[PDB]
Design a protein around this ligand. Structure first.
Ligand SMILES: C[C@@H]1O[C@@H](O[C@H]2C[C@@H](O)[C@]3(CO)[C@H]4[C@H](O)C[C@]5(C)[C@@H](C6=CC(=O)OC6)CC[C@]5(O)[C@@H]4CC[C@]3(O)C2)[C@H](O)[C@H](OC(=O)c2c3ccccc3cc3ccccc23)[C@H]1O
Ligand SMILES: *[C@@H]1O[C@H](CO)[C@@H](O[C@@H]2O[C@H](CO)[C@@H](O)[C@H](O)[C@H]2NC(C)=O)[C@H](O)[C@H]1NC(C)=O
Ligand SMILES: CC(C)CCC[C@@H](C)[C@H]1CC[C@H]2[C@@H]3CC=C4C[C@@H](O)CC[C@]4(C)[C@H]3CC[C@]12C
Ligand SMILES: CC(C)CCC[C@@H](C)[C@H]1CC[C@H]2[C@@H]3CC=C4C[C@@H](O)CC[C@]4(C)[C@H]3CC[C@]12C
Ligand SMILES: CC(C)CCC[C@@H](C)[C@H]1CC[C@H]2[C@@H]3CC=C4C[C@@H](O)CC[C@]4(C)[C@H]3CC[C@]12C
Ligand SMILES: *[C@@H]1O[C@H](CO)[C@@H](O)[C@H](O)[C@H]1NC(C)=O
Ligand SMILES: [Mg+2]
Ligand SMILES: [Mg+2]
Ligand SMILES: [Mg+2]
Lengths: 32, 291, 996
């Protein structure tokens, strides 16, 4: 049915992106 | 300290004359480009969506359940004698059913006589514009017995024992699916289970359920629900002047001078509910016939 | 009537020093040889108070907490929170179950103010704590003679009028009246500023109670000799005591950075109330009642206040101040970190601040050639020439004929910073031999001394006969030193290139010109000579005389001269040059003799070569000074004696028409007059001092700079910046950091002010066109107090776009921190594009869900209704309350994300003011972290499970993130071409409007 959105997949993708972007920023600020 | 009015350098409000035209002209050009750009983006955005279908319909998954007397707080308080006390209700009911009169649905090129018995779903091809303007099945006020419009008794539904019809939220491409075998709440209200969406009203607690004496429902052929022959919806563009099904509910033995709560819950598989939205699927009303 | 007490303390002091010994003992009633009876002590100790300055006024802990709680910036947020509570009361008294939006906003603003005050208090308290860990002053008792018996009692137990004996090495307890001295040379460095130790003579010499030698002062150390004296003043009644209490009673003033912050707040409130009133009239003009219009007015003004800008500016100033503290440039005032960058006139002290306050061997004369010894503090200067035998002869005369040496604990301490007992000159000679000729410990005993003759008043000479070293066999060495003009007369032989020559006038006058050359250079010359007593005519064993002089006073062999003076600090000359490079007018304010001040000024950079004074031109023309025109002289020496008889207008005439000014013999009170004269011109002043004479000058000035170790405690407390390492270069670092943080403040402020347009505009058109709310309140809080916190902070780590140390100091009345150009950019151009991008995302989401943009006109009326659950869209579908409301919240969250998207480009463009982003480069690691953290934080605020229920920020469909991308790229491209046009066309319009 067109009245259903896989919100779990998009929500999970957003969480994964947030985690990756945050750790990458930390890598840039904690450069060695 | 606020005498920035003028100066010997021809200053007004702070700057010179030749400076105001320069700044104003730049802001006019700049803001004009900004407006044209925003409009240019919004135009391609209008080209993204289609005319026969909303690109997103998940936010309307569980259809609602509204009523004819759109009360300020879903409460119907009036006097069985004073005609002006219930004028706000009757006015809304008449304006609602004004598009359902036999004279309103007279053109046969846009209306189709479905039938006196609820039948299966009527799919009019795909949602594209390859076909012409789809037909809309008629729905006469006579189906809502004892709560009819202006036919023989423009009763106003209020001389004691009022009427409150319910309506299913019109959703495009939505195909209602009534329940089946697993019936923990499906009461024997009516035999017609397969081609009608059942809706049952009740109290809310041990008090309201006792105060509300008897409820009489009216629908297509006498079934308390919505016939499947009127769905799915094909949008306002392809189906103008569409008349969604209606179903009336009357409360005969009510406890006058007592505010009682009623919950009209619509049952079905494609009908969801929500503890945050008291209108998704179910429906509430606070009736008080104070004499 | 405290206005008169302050002036009484400002007036020069007077005394009763010029009194006969009988008159002096009559005024106080004290024996000249036995002091006073012990019972007489309790009659004065418990009468006026113990001999100690009254501790400075104490300001309790919670006072600073409330000081930062109110402030000037926190007041804007306090009034915002008050308006929030007022609007909430007006909103609660009209509707049924109300909404908690305004209450949360009010408590948030209150917490913001409290958080800023707490952070500021923590930083300032940490500064004061580490400062307390460095001022561990220990009591120093006095040697008082009472009842005819010597007794060492605490300094606080000393009273007025009791004989006190100060030994060479003891600190002068209180102000004394010398009655019997034996060559005592007190060090009046911390009080008056006289570099060379001034001798104290019991007889009255000068009318001025300071220049006179019959007065000992508080906080002064007895370099050498011994002396006796009657206590004249005690406790706060002392000279330096009155100067300290005057420093405690002066006004600090308004710092330039705080004034800029206030002007910024004034403009912020200007647009806030302007938009609130204009929109109030418009809101009423359309269809809203007075009751709703007041709510609007308050919402427009409150929403127009930058909440998160307070914490960002605070941490901004804190970060720069921390970089200052790393370089020992401690700042007690959190906002005084910028004050240096705006300074345009530095009034410095000579003794202690510019110089090291240590008599050091500067030049020497040997073999008819001046030899400049290194005068650095860390021993990093050019090394003199030491290869001839005359150097060894001079080194022997200096290292041998010297009264004393170093002390006990002075073993691990460096050769320069170690204490030495004796005169200031002998200590210099000792250090020079210990640094250039090996050691003096084994060199003095190796030449056993037999008969030594100390300095004399009549027939002034200082000589000593020693024994002979390793086999050479001359058997005797008679060394002598003294005034060059006196030692030259009693000399016949002259050492040159190793051999001896006669006293021929040819090479004899070569010594006279060297003496006048070293004297005119501002140094103290001393002649040294020696003679080998022939052991064939004078016995090799015991043959000496002391009453009827036997050693030949004449026919000695002259070796050379040895000049000395307190040299300037290592980095002082380069620092003065760097300050003059940026356009800072260097003015010397000291209390030393003009003879030394002019030389030090010419040596550090305050007086360059070529510029002549009113006296130098007259001497060059052999004409009286009253004939030359003062306009012909670029520099001038201002005598303190002539400044006392000067008015307020004449001082301005001296400061305007003269670039290089040197104020000599200026009392501590006159320094304040000079500072006020410099402030009358409207320029920012900075005073750098070390002694107690600089306390009122370092207090009244916009910023005081004290020496961590070479600065007295009084002036160290009255100042605003402490130099722990005494590195005068810290001044250069401070001015650089001040201007750097000023520019970064402009950038950070513009970044926070740009976000206000896409923040208020949704609520504005929400009322204008009656469309559903495009942006919520919670989201705005997640923007100003959320994402944008790190970008505004990282904008403080930005670095110079050009050579900041090359431009002139900013004008306080011309170059404003937040001018109208910044507002024209944020509220006018950039913010407008950000708002357009937000509205684009709004319509994109609503139209894709079935609510086309056209249909949104006038839909708010039934959109906010909690009971109309049949709202029809553009397709004919009916939406319930929670359904369309979920769409509204899932339309608010992407608006916040849209703000982040446009903030990317806003941060990149605000990172540079004139240069291109590629010319500067995004090397700011903190800025890149800010972009990644801001993006991740927003993504978390939207995709976290339970956000649609806690903050009502539902997840976003991925295709929404790309809605604001073209707008951000446009912001970047537009501002990039803007700065490029300002770079290639630094003319008018593109520079007078955009450039902020
Ligand atoms: C025009 C109004 O529009 C709507 O509200 C808007 C305006 C305002 O009321 C807001 C309340 O805080 C404003 C606020 O003012 C400004 C803010 C704090 C401002 C900011 C400043 C800042 O620093 O950051 C952000 C931006 C917007 C803001 O964040 C809030 C957001 C929430 C608002 O609720 C939004 C309502 O429909 C309102 O109606 C009713 O409230 C209403 C009734 C009123 C009277 C009597 C009977 C009623 C019965 C009702 C029954 C059921 C439902 C409503 C009833 C309209 O009057
Ligand atoms: C429709 O209206 C009629 C009135 O003409 C209703 O008649 C009811 O008849 C029953 C049986 O005698 C009585 O108990 C009720 O009191 C009557 N109602 C009224 C309002 O008078 C009739 O029941 C109504 N409903 C239907 C389904 O016909
Ligand atoms: C200098 C500029 C171009 C940097 C642009 C950064 C782009 C490439 C990054 C920044 C944030 C990112 C988005 C972060 C959040 C989401 C939601 C998620 O459910 C799918 C991925 C998606 C849609 C990401 C796509 C890539 C993205 C848009
Ligand atoms: C919905 C839309 C039309 C409202 C947006 C507000 C616009 C029109 C307002 C907001 C702030 C305003 C600007 C504020 C600052 C400046 C700089 C000043 O020296 C001249 C006026 C000028 C250039 C204003 C022009 C009008 C302006 C840009
Ligand atoms: C001369 C050139 C640069 C102008 C071309 C205009 C471009 C940059 C504009 C025109 C219409 C815009 C698009 C309109 C529709 C959509 C779909 C939506 O779900 C995300 C935004 C997105 C993808 C927009 C991105 C930017 C866009 C493609
Ligand atoms: C209401 O009337 C009906 C009539 O059939 C009766 O059965 C019922 O018990 C009554 N209820 C109350 C609460 O009066
Ligand atoms: Mg804000
Ligand atoms: Mg000094
Ligand atoms: Mg100060």
């Amino acid at each position: 049915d067109p009245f259903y959105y896989d919100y779990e997949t998009v929500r999970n993708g957003g969480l994964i992106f947030a985690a990756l972007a945050f750790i990458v920023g930390l890598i840039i600020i904690l450069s060695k | 300290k606020k005498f920035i009015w003028n100066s010997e350098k021809k200053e007004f409000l702070g700057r010179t004359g030749g400076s105001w035209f320069k700044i104003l002209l730049f802001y006019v050009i700049f803001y004009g480009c900004l407006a044209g750009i925003f409009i240019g983006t919004i135009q391609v955005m209008l080209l993204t969506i289609s005319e026969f279908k909303p690109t997103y319909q998940d936010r309307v998954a569980p259809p609602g359940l509204t009523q004819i007397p759109q009360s300020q707080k879903t409460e119907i308080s009036f006097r069985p004698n004073d005609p002006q006390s219930y004028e706000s209700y009757v006015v809304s009911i008449v304006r609602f059913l004004e598009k359902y009169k036999d004279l309103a649905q007279k053109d046969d090129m846009i209306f189709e006589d479905c039938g006196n018995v609820p039948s299966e779903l009527k799919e009019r091809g795909e949602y594209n514009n390859e076909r012409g303007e789809r037909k809309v099945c008629r729905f006469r006020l006579e189906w809502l017995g004892n709560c009819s419009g202006l036919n023989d008794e423009t009763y106003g539904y209020k001389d004691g024992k009022p009427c409150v019809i319910i309506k299913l939220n019109r959703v495009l491409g939505f195909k209602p699916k009534p329940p089946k075998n697993e019936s923990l709440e499906t009461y024997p209200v009516m035999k017609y289970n397969p081609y009608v969406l059942p809706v049952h009203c009740t109290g809310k607690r041990d008090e309201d359920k006792e105060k509300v004496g008897t409820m009489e429902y009216f629908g297509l052929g006498g079934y308390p629900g919505f016939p499947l022959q009127y769905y799915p919806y094909y949008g306002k563009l392809l189906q103008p002047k569409y008349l969604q099904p209606l179903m009336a509910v009357q409360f005969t033995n009510l406890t006058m001078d007592t505010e009682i709560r009623i919950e009209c819950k619509a049952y079905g598989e494609n009908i969801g509910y929500s503890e945050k939205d008291r209108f998704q699927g179910r429906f509430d009303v606070k009736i008080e016939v104070k004499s | 009537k405290e206005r008169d007490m302050d002036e009484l303390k400002k007036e020069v002091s007077m005394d009763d020093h010029k009194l006969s010994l009988d008159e002096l003992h009559r005024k106080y009633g004290t024996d000249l040889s036995r002091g006073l009876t012990p019972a007489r002590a309790a009659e004065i100790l418990a009468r006026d108070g113990p001999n100690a300055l009254t501790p400075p006024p104490t300001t309790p802990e919670w006072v600073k907490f409330c000081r930062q709680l109110f402030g000037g910036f926190s007041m804007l947020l306090w009034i915002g929170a008050i308006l929030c509570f007022l609007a909430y009361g007006i909103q609660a008294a009209t509707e049924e179950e109300p909404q908690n939006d305004n209450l949360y906003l009010g408590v948030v603003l209150s917490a913001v103010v409290i958080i800023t005050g707490c952070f500021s208090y923590y930083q300032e308290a940490k500064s004061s704590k580490i400062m307390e860990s460095f001022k561990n002053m220990v009591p120093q008792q006095a040697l008082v003679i009472r009842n005819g018996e010597k007794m060492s009692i605490n300094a606080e137990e000393v009273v007025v009028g009791d004989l006190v004996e100060v030994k060479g090495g003891d600190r002068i307890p209180a102000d004394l009246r010398i009655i019997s001295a034996n060559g005592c040379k007190v060090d009046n460095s911390s009080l008056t500023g006289e570099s060379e130790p001034q001798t104290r003579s019991p007889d009255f010499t000068n009318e001025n109670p300071l220049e006179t030698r019959n007065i000992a002062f508080f906080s002064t150390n007895c370099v050498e000799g011994t002396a006796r004296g009657i206590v004249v003043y005690t406790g706060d009644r002392t000279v330096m005591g009155r100067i300290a209490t005057l420093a405690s009673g002066l006004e600090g003033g308004q710092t330039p950075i705080a004034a800029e912050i206030e002007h910024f707040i004034h403009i912020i409130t200007g647009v806030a109330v302007f938009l609130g009133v204009s929109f109030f009239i418009l809101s009423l003009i359309l269809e809203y009642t007075w009751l709703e219009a007041v709510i609007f007015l308050i919402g427009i003004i409150v929403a127009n206040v930058p909440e998160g800008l307070l914490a960002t500016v605070t941490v901004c100033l804190t970060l720069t101040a921390k970089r200052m503290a790393r370089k020992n440039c401690l700042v007690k005032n959190l906002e005084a970190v910028e004050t240096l960058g705006s300074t345009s006139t530095i009034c410095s002290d000579k003794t202690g601040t510019l110089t090291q306050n240590r008599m050091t061997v500067a030049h020497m004369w040997s073999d008819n050639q001046i030899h400049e010894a290194d005068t650095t503090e860390n021993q990093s200067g050019v090394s003199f020439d030491k290869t001839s035998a005359t150097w060894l002869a001079l080194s022997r005369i200096a290292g041998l004929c010297n009264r004393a040496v170093f002390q006990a604990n002075q073993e691990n301490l460096p050769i320069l910073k170690r204490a030495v007992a004796g005169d200031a000159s002998e200590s210099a000679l000792l250090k020079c031999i210990e640094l250039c000729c090996g050691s003096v410990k084994e060199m003095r005993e190796r030449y056993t001394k037999i008969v030594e003759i100390p300095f004399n008043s009549t027939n002034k000479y200082q000589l000593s006969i020693h024994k002979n070293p390793n086999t050479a066999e001359p058997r005797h060495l008679l060394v002598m030193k003294g005034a060059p003009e006196r030692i030259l007369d009693r000399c016949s032989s002259i050492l040159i290139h190793g051999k001896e020559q006669p006293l021929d006038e040819e090479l004899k006058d070569a010594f006279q010109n060297a003496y006048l050359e070293l004297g005119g250079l501002g140094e103290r010359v001393l002649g040294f000579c020696h003679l080998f007593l022939p052991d064939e005519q004078f016995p090799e064993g015991f043959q000496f005389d002391t009453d009827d002089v036997n050693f030949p006073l004449d026919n000695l062999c002259f070796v050379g001269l040895i000049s000395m003076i307190d040299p300037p600090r290592a980095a002082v000359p380069d620092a003065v040059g760097k300050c003059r490079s940026a356009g800072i007018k260097v003015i010397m304010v000291t209390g030393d003799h003009p003879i030394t001040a002019k030389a030090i000024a010419k040596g550090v950079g305050i007086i360059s070569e070529g510029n002549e004074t009113v006296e130098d031109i007259a001497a060059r023309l052999n004409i009286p000074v009253s004939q030359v025109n003062p306009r012909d002289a670029k520099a001038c020496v201002v005598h303190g004696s002539d400044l006392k008889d000067m008015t307020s207008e004449q001082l301005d005439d001296i400061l305007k028409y003269h670039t290089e000014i040197v104020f000599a013999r200026t009392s501590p009170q006159q320094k304040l007059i000079i500072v006020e004269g410099c402030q009358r011109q409207g320029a920012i002043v900075a005073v750098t001092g070390d002694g107690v004479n600089d306390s009122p000058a370092s207090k009244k000035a916009d910023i005081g700079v004290a020496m961590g170790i070479a600065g007295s405690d009084v002036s160290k407390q009255a100042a605003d910046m402490i130099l722990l390492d005494d590195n005068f270069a810290s001044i250069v670092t401070g001015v650089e950091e001040g201007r750097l943080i000023f520019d970064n403040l402009k950038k950070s402020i513009a970044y926070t002010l740009t976000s206000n347009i896409p923040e208020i505009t949704p609520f504005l058109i929400f009322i204008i066109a009656n469309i559903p709310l495009p942006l919520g309140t919670v989201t705005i809080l997640c923007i100003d107090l959320g994402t944008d916190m790190v970008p505004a902070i990282s904008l403080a780590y930005e670095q110079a776009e050009s050579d900041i140390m090359k431009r002139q100091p900013r004008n306080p009345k011309t170059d404003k921190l937040v001018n109208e150009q910044l507002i024209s950019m944020a509220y006018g151009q950039i913010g407008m594009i950000q708002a357009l991008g937000g509205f684009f995302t709004y319509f994109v989401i609503l139209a894709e869900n079935g609510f086309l943009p056209i249909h949104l006109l006038g839909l708010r009326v039934n959109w906010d209704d909690r009971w109309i659950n049949d709202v029809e869209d553009s397709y004919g579908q009916q939406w319930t309350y929670e359904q369309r409301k979920i769409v509204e919240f899932t339309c608010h969250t992407p608006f916040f994300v849209t703000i982040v998207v446009v903030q990317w480009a806003d941060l990149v463009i605000c990172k540079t003011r004139r240069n291109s982003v590629f010319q500067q480069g995004m090397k700011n690691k903190i800025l890149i972290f800010g972009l990644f953290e801001e993006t991740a934080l927003a993504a978390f605020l939207s995709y976290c499970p339970g956000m649609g229920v806690a903050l009502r920020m539902y997840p976003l469909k991925p295709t929404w993130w790309f809605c604001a991308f073209p707008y951000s790229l446009l912001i970047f491209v537009y501002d990039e071409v803007r700065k490029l046009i300002i770079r290639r066309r630094p003319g008018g319009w593109v520079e007078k409007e955009t450039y902020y």
